[PDB]
Curated annotation (Swiss-Prot):
The N-terminal alpha-hairpin extension is required for pectinmethylesterase inhibitor activity. It comes from the Eukaryota. This is Pectinesterase inhibitor 1. It comes from Arabidopsis thaliana. The gene is PMEI1. The keyword Glycoprotein applies.
Length: 149
């Protein structure tokens, strides 16, 4: 039994992880699976940055505006962190990947905390933030399992 076939038990939302690995017929090669996971995570982050900007540009109230602007800053940083995560993955450096994915996760988590006190919130921002947190959680488990140099 490959690690991939049971890896979801080590995540906060195993349902999400099971959906993700089945939907994408996940590689049993952990290096390959790290890369496809990062791909999905970066695509989601980039989409979310665009959504946040669209919401801000449409004109929200000051409380929402500060929250979504904080989310933009967190996502700009998270996107950079995921870019670095890719760079380290390309060298086979699982630990490097892990540190940078961890930093990205905090960006998504911080966005979720920045929007929590809002009376009414954009569901795609909340849902994408949760999705990115979950995807980072999967990538952390994978990067942990890659061979040490």
């Amino acid at each position: 039994s490959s690690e991939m076939s049971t890896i979801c038990d080590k995540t906060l939302n195993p349902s999400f992880c099971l959906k993700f690995l089945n939907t994408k017929f996940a590689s049993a090669n952990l290096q390959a699976l790290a890369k496809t996971t990062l791909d999905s995570t970066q695509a989601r982050a980039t989409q979310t940055l665009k959504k946040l900007q669209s919401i801000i540009d449409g004109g929200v109230d000051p409380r929402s505006k500060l929250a979504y602007r904080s989310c933009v800053d967190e996502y700009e940083s998270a996107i950079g962190n995921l870019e670095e995560a890719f760079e380290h993955l390309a060298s086979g450096d699982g630990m490097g990947m892990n540190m940078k994915v961890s930093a990205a996760l905090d960006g998504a988590d911080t966005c979720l905390d920045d929007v929590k006190r809002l009376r009414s919130v954009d569901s795609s921002v909340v849902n994408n933030s949760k999705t990115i947190k979950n995807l980072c959680g999967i990538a952390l488990v994978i990067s942990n399992m890659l061979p040490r140099n």
